[PDB]
Amino acid sequence: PFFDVQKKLGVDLDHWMTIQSAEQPHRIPARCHAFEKEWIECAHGIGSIRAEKECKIEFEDFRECLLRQKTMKRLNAIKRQRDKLIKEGKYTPPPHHSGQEDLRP
Amino acid sequence: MNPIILIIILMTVMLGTIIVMISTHWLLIWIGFEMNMLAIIPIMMKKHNPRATEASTKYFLTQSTASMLLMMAIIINLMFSGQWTVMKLFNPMASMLMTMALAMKLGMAPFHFWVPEVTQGIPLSSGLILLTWQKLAPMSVLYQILPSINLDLILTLSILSITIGGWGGLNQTQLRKIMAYSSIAHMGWMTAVLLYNPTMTLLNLIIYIIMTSTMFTLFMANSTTTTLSLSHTWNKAPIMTILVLITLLSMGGLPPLSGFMPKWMIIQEMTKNDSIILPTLMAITALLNLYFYMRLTYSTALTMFPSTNNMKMKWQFPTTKRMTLLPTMTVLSTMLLPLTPILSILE
Amino acid sequence: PGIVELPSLEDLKVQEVKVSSSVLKAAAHHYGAQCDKPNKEFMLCRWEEKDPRRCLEEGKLVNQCALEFFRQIKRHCAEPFTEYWTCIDYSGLQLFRRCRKEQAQFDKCVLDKLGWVRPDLGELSKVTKVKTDRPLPENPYHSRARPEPNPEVEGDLKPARHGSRLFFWTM
Amino acid sequence: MMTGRQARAPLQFLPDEARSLPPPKLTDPRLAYIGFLGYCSGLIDNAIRRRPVLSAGLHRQFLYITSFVFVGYYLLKRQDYMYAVRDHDMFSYIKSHPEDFPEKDKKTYREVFEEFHPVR
Amino acid sequence: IMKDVPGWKVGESVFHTTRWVTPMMGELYGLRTGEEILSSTYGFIWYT
Amino acid sequence: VAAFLKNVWAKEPVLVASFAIAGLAVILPTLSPYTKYSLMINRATPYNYPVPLRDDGNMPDVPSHPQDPQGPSLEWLKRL
Amino acid sequence: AKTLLHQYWDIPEGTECHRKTYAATSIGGASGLVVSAYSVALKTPTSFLEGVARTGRYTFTAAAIGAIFGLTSCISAQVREKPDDPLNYLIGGCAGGLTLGARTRSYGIGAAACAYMGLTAALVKMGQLEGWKVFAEPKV
Amino acid sequence: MSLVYMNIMMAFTVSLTGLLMYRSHLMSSLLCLEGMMLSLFILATLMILNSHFTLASMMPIILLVFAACEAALGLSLLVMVSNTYGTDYVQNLNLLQC
Amino acid sequence: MNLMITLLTNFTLATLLVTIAFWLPQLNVYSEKTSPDPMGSARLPFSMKFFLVAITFLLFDLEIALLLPLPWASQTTNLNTMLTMALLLIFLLAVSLAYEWTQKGLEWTE
Amino acid sequence: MMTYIVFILSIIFVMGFVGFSSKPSPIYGGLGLIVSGGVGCGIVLNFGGSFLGLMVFLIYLGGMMVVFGYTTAMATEQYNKVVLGTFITGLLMEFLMVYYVLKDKEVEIVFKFNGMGDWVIYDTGDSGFFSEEAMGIAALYSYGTWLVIVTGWSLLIGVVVIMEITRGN
């Protein structure tokens, strides 16, 4: 079973390490702090079944923030299209994507 | 065997198991598992004989492989979830790896291949510890991960463990190998019911712990390790023969004894979820268990095996061993049936 | 999903503070003392909006007033600033402790010609207040409605109805 | 299967609302059965150490009976509290959702058809 | 770049929320030359 | 308690020296009252920006400028 | 080997013999491969050639059992014009038992395998018709 | 995810298929155990350093130390075999079967 | 990449040195050494004290790695908890050293 | 080619594991896994984790596998076909997956895996005047009370285990 001594005698042992959105030294933010915050606030106190049936969009957004799969597919498709269009040579890249554009600062 | 060192080692084992019980982080679960196995290694090297070294080597290799699988599951869960609460996993591979990691830890067939060997090569106190207290922590781990447990894998492991344990205990004549295969069969029996109602799992775990403790306490009290000395014990104390007979009757789930309490009620949670063939199959394998149990009681008390001449000196000396908690655990393993709904305290 | 909204380059064209690291590091204390209010306004907008696209114009205000700092440096005491930033710029670590004489000379020249006080230790490390005219955003995270919580338990704990009901038990 | 009920007050053997129930009497048959189990444990302890079973260790037998009756009383209290929680939650969820529990019109036997299979 | 392929909307953010999300290294420098990518994503770690 | 001390000094000077130094290092941080000075030195280091808070209209303990007298100053490290 | 069971059950009973025969043969081959792999892992082979001989013997025996059982069930279902009958699976199970007894050079073992495999195939048809679930999902 | 993640998984499966079907003595098993050690360490460190979870930098170092002591235990076990049979071969581990 | 450039240059210079020491004197035509130690034919004895002190080194180095991050930790806000933790960890090192002293560890290889 | 350096090292890392996967002899396996530990630490170091990489160098390689070599020097007295067959099998699987991820840039073994270079998931942000992992490790003595307690207890108990189970009596 799951004995909750920490909730019984009111002493923290490992609650701080448990989640990524918890308090950390010098308040250093994670990559997906807001997504995890919204997912936890969606899935608090309502049960795991209703959390996985009702807050699926927030958890999917958090998983996409963690893994970055759709961004990988989008960028790979864009780069493959650039390689193809440079193969048949219909379009040429602009000077601002080659390193000779007098960068902003 | 310094008593201070033994006390500290036992406290370390208790601390590791309770760290598995009371923590809320996967790293602390693994911490408790590692400290538990590290402090249980000297328990199986108590007598300092090479068979104990063989058994401890096999045990360490299997437990370390299971622990490495456990980190594989934890790191995969971290990748797919980004959080560390001990709850339902967020990946099917994490659940699969965790399930066979805990099956390797608990000696569930076909990962049971270390259980009948290691228990054969260690002293009876270490065998009692391994077959009673070691099973507690991964039961808690499996209880806390039950939403994400795949049904097919745990059911296949349960039926394979029950069948293999019964068929492997059907042949052995040593007491420790029979105990090991009986433990395997009981493990499969109480992991088959886990996904439907874990209160039945906890009740069967408590009943099996009490009954195995009674069996091992009787074996250390009679100083018997094989079938023949357990047959020979009837010259020394017939009341111990009566006690081992009644608790082996209880061990096969024959009413009106305590061993009929869990499994029958396990069937009470099989037909609720519309499953009929499964409790019948596990009941037939429990009948196999009862067959080699009946063989043990035929060898022990229901007959009168021929003895040797030296029993007479053993009739001039009472049992000086510290027979601790034998009557209470013997009574609690035989006449607990009319207090069946006490399982409600395990909710 | 939805189309991500981006302002064009026409909202991003401004004059740039084309200065080195040591040039900013030499007058950073007078930077924090003189142009403090637009900086506080801009970063309060940044911290509460949590969106660059709703703060850009405010940053432009900073990019005006900061230039108004450097012009006041250029027309009056350009030579002590030149000495100070080149002495700071010689050090690879850009240590403040190795150019104390030029720091004192620049401080004296500024205090006689224009009168800006170098802040003490701990003055710039404290939290200040901002009077801002923007409204408070009620939904900074762009979050929908939270799910309805499940109902709790209510009523007195009644005794058991006809016992445990475990196939023959009435107690 | 009550993982969401006791989580607000964990590690409580007997909570405060358990005091709202009628406590079991000292003459409960289950309690007397547990006392009989304690007496049997004392008899077994006297028998396994080669002692007179009905005479030796009277204080030992009384301690066995007393400890067994104490733990049995507390376990019975926890069981009664748990089953009160169970049927209270049953009645509460039945009351809260009466769309999934329609009132069945119990028809009389004067018009319902029961198929008859003669025996011969 | 790509006006010919079907099933494409320009600026289709992959996140369901409309909240601002921090850009990636691949989202910013993912269309430049390799040297700028090297000096951006590995310039600090490889700086002596 | 006196002859045993000199006995352990003459037999094992290294062990008694290590025990004495360990006891001094145990009892001296509590006895010395300068630990709080290190505490306020560590707590006052601005690793992150003191992000300004919105003025509702009623806050006398916060200033509108870093040069204003109200607020926590750090002159005690300057004087020591 | 879950979808292979579905492909075996996707073909209606007593309609097309060929695809049922190959599906049952593939099921038997997979089962024999698992049994042979476990036998090689547990019982150490004398050499590579004897090990692959035992593997081929087990695999071909189980494949023949599957093919004979499927073929016999299909021809019995065709000759009785009744797909919804456990008699066809009983006859197919007895044919599989007879083939196993002939492979193992025995006749009493063959008759016992007839009885037990016919009863098992009858129960398989029982579960297919009445929807028996031995691997039941948690409902309550 | 990233390709280095899948490379670490393939490395861990390589260590798994090397740890089980051994032919040599127990040192090969402990070496494959250290392969599992190293793969898990690198994977955990990459995960913690990629997602900017600052606190969970306690995870990798601890993930070594504990099992490292456990690894030391295994070495002692081998010494026991080296004090009993002369060689630590796994084919000499056939005394508990009967 | 400059660090790896230095490592590659240093490793290749070592390779050049060992190539000079291994293959350059092979030009000479001196002789072939047929050549037909106290160890006669006995097996190598397993001096257990060396293995014991090696694993003691391993455990001490592991908890030295535990003890390591104090210079970075010294800037933390909660100094009292740090002081208690560091003193208790060094006390644990002292206790482990005392146990390794008492149970015949530091004898016959002191 | 350069921008996939970690991935290239990762390939070498897999190669390093093959270097002791067949296990012909413990000493050569230890050497191969030493090389694999070095390239895996290079993988860690290229992500900005200097402290964890030097933890790998100082403890895993220079302080513990030294003990492994010390122990294996006490056995395996000085002076295969299926070893080489497994080596070519691992080589073929490794190179086949290499062409899979270099041509398709996507594969399925358990999940969906991409073959594009890993230089897209890094961060352009700044931690300020401190390394993130440095004070991440430094937070152990201020927050990790229970973890340090159980770590010291487990290591002391391991010392007890070493003193007891190797006594022989």
mmCIF file of N, CA and C in Angstrom, chain E residues 1-45:
data_model
loop_
_atom_site.group_PDB
_atom_site.id
_atom_site.type_symbol
_atom_site.label_atom_id
_atom_site.label_comp_id
_atom_site.label_asym_id
_atom_site.label_seq_id
_atom_site.Cartn_x
_atom_site.Cartn_y
_atom_site.Cartn_z
ATOM 1 N N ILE E 1 8.404 30.172 -49.505
ATOM 2 C CA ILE E 1 9.237 29.117 -50.077
ATOM 3 C C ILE E 1 8.370 28.104 -50.815
ATOM 4 N N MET E 2 7.244 27.720 -50.222
ATOM 5 C CA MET E 2 6.478 26.554 -50.645
ATOM 6 C C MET E 2 5.002 26.927 -50.773
ATOM 7 N N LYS E 3 4.633 27.285 -52.002
ATOM 8 C CA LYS E 3 3.284 27.673 -52.378
ATOM 9 C C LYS E 3 2.579 26.595 -53.187
ATOM 10 N N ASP E 4 3.217 25.442 -53.375
ATOM 11 C CA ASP E 4 2.720 24.418 -54.280
ATOM 12 C C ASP E 4 2.112 23.213 -53.582
ATOM 13 N N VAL E 5 2.631 22.825 -52.421
ATOM 14 C CA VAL E 5 2.161 21.624 -51.733
ATOM 15 C C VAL E 5 0.802 21.901 -51.098
ATOM 16 N N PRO E 6 -0.079 20.909 -51.023
ATOM 17 C CA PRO E 6 -1.386 21.102 -50.393
ATOM 18 C C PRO E 6 -1.334 20.819 -48.896
ATOM 19 N N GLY E 7 -2.428 21.168 -48.226
ATOM 20 C CA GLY E 7 -2.564 20.900 -46.802
ATOM 21 C C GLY E 7 -1.593 21.661 -45.925
ATOM 22 N N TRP E 8 -1.395 22.948 -46.199
ATOM 23 C CA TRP E 8 -0.468 23.770 -45.433
ATOM 24 C C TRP E 8 -1.081 25.132 -45.157
ATOM 25 N N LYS E 9 -1.044 25.547 -43.895
ATOM 26 C CA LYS E 9 -1.389 26.901 -43.486
ATOM 27 C C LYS E 9 -0.143 27.561 -42.918
ATOM 28 N N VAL E 10 0.153 28.775 -43.385
ATOM 29 C CA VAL E 10 1.349 29.473 -42.932
ATOM 30 C C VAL E 10 1.150 29.966 -41.504
ATOM 31 N N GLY E 11 2.199 29.849 -40.693
ATOM 32 C CA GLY E 11 2.111 30.260 -39.306
ATOM 33 C C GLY E 11 1.269 29.369 -38.426
ATOM 34 N N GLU E 12 1.101 28.102 -38.792
ATOM 35 C CA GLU E 12 0.315 27.168 -37.990
ATOM 36 C C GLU E 12 1.142 26.760 -36.779
ATOM 37 N N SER E 13 0.853 27.370 -35.632
ATOM 38 C CA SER E 13 1.530 27.001 -34.397
ATOM 39 C C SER E 13 1.101 25.608 -33.959
ATOM 40 N N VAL E 14 2.067 24.823 -33.474
ATOM 41 C CA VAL E 14 1.791 23.439 -33.098
ATOM 42 C C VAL E 14 1.179 23.309 -31.714
ATOM 43 N N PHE E 15 1.122 24.393 -30.947
ATOM 44 C CA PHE E 15 0.538 24.382 -29.614
ATOM 45 C C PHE E 15 -0.908 24.851 -29.674
ATOM 46 N N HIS E 16 -1.772 24.178 -28.910
ATOM 47 C CA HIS E 16 -3.193 24.509 -28.926
ATOM 48 C C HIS E 16 -3.472 25.849 -28.259
ATOM 49 N N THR E 17 -2.697 26.209 -27.240
ATOM 50 C CA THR E 17 -2.895 27.486 -26.574
ATOM 51 C C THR E 17 -2.400 28.635 -27.446
ATOM 52 N N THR E 18 -2.973 29.812 -27.214
ATOM 53 C CA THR E 18 -2.543 31.037 -27.870
ATOM 54 C C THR E 18 -1.533 31.815 -27.039
ATOM 55 N N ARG E 19 -1.096 31.257 -25.913
ATOM 56 C CA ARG E 19 -0.087 31.895 -25.079
ATOM 57 C C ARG E 19 1.255 31.932 -25.800
ATOM 58 N N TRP E 20 2.044 32.961 -25.497
ATOM 59 C CA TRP E 20 3.381 33.066 -26.059
ATOM 60 C C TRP E 20 4.278 31.959 -25.522
ATOM 61 N N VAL E 21 5.033 31.341 -26.423
ATOM 62 C CA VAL E 21 5.949 30.258 -26.098
ATOM 63 C C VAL E 21 7.353 30.698 -26.495
ATOM 64 N N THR E 22 8.336 30.363 -25.661
ATOM 65 C CA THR E 22 9.713 30.734 -25.950
ATOM 66 C C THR E 22 10.204 30.022 -27.210
ATOM 67 N N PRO E 23 10.867 30.735 -28.115
ATOM 68 C CA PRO E 23 11.333 30.109 -29.356
ATOM 69 C C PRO E 23 12.517 29.187 -29.112
ATOM 70 N N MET E 24 12.693 28.253 -30.039
ATOM 71 C CA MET E 24 13.809 27.325 -30.004
ATOM 72 C C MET E 24 15.020 27.888 -30.736
ATOM 73 N N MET E 25 16.157 27.221 -30.535
ATOM 74 C CA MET E 25 17.312 27.453 -31.392
ATOM 75 C C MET E 25 17.023 27.027 -32.824
ATOM 76 N N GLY E 26 16.331 25.900 -33.000
ATOM 77 C CA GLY E 26 15.957 25.473 -34.335
ATOM 78 C C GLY E 26 14.842 26.301 -34.938
ATOM 79 N N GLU E 27 14.034 26.949 -34.098
ATOM 80 C CA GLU E 27 12.983 27.819 -34.607
ATOM 81 C C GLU E 27 13.511 29.174 -35.058
ATOM 82 N N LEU E 28 14.676 29.591 -34.559
ATOM 83 C CA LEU E 28 15.267 30.876 -34.918
ATOM 84 C C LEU E 28 16.377 30.721 -35.953
ATOM 85 N N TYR E 29 17.398 29.924 -35.636
ATOM 86 C CA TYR E 29 18.569 29.757 -36.481
ATOM 87 C C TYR E 29 18.461 28.544 -37.397
ATOM 88 N N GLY E 30 17.271 27.965 -37.528
ATOM 89 C CA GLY E 30 17.111 26.748 -38.294
ATOM 90 C C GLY E 30 17.062 26.911 -39.793
ATOM 91 N N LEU E 31 17.182 28.139 -40.300
ATOM 92 C CA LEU E 31 17.136 28.387 -41.734
ATOM 93 C C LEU E 31 18.356 29.152 -42.237
ATOM 94 N N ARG E 32 19.410 29.262 -41.433
ATOM 95 C CA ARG E 32 20.620 29.981 -41.796
ATOM 96 C C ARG E 32 21.721 29.006 -42.210
ATOM 97 N N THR E 33 22.925 29.538 -42.408
ATOM 98 C CA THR E 33 24.084 28.723 -42.734
ATOM 99 C C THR E 33 24.529 27.912 -41.516
ATOM 100 N N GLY E 34 25.371 26.908 -41.775
ATOM 101 C CA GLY E 34 25.813 26.023 -40.712
ATOM 102 C C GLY E 34 26.739 26.678 -39.706
ATOM 103 N N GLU E 35 27.523 27.670 -40.144
ATOM 104 C CA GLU E 35 28.469 28.324 -39.243
ATOM 105 C C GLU E 35 27.752 29.138 -38.172
ATOM 106 N N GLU E 36 26.669 29.824 -38.546
ATOM 107 C CA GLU E 36 25.898 30.572 -37.560
ATOM 108 C C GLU E 36 25.211 29.634 -36.577
ATOM 109 N N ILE E 37 24.742 28.480 -37.063
ATOM 110 C CA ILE E 37 24.169 27.459 -36.189
ATOM 111 C C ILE E 37 25.211 26.962 -35.195
ATOM 112 N N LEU E 38 26.435 26.717 -35.674
ATOM 113 C CA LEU E 38 27.514 26.263 -34.800
ATOM 114 C C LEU E 38 27.844 27.305 -33.741
ATOM 115 N N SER E 39 28.025 28.561 -34.158
ATOM 116 C CA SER E 39 28.382 29.619 -33.219
ATOM 117 C C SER E 39 27.245 29.966 -32.268
ATOM 118 N N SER E 40 26.002 29.632 -32.616
ATOM 119 C CA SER E 40 24.883 29.883 -31.716
ATOM 120 C C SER E 40 24.686 28.744 -30.717
ATOM 121 N N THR E 41 24.491 27.520 -31.208
ATOM 122 C CA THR E 41 24.142 26.409 -30.331
ATOM 123 C C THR E 41 25.349 25.728 -29.695
ATOM 124 N N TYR E 42 26.572 26.007 -30.162
ATOM 125 C CA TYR E 42 27.759 25.415 -29.558
ATOM 126 C C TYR E 42 28.870 26.432 -29.341
ATOM 127 N N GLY E 43 28.599 27.724 -29.530
ATOM 128 C CA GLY E 43 29.643 28.722 -29.364
ATOM 129 C C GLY E 43 30.107 28.865 -27.927
ATOM 130 N N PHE E 44 29.171 28.840 -26.976
ATOM 131 C CA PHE E 44 29.527 29.060 -25.578
ATOM 132 C C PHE E 44 30.272 27.866 -24.994
ATOM 133 N N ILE E 45 29.803 26.650 -25.278
ATOM 134 C CA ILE E 45 30.405 25.460 -24.686
ATOM 135 C C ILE E 45 31.802 25.228 -25.251
#
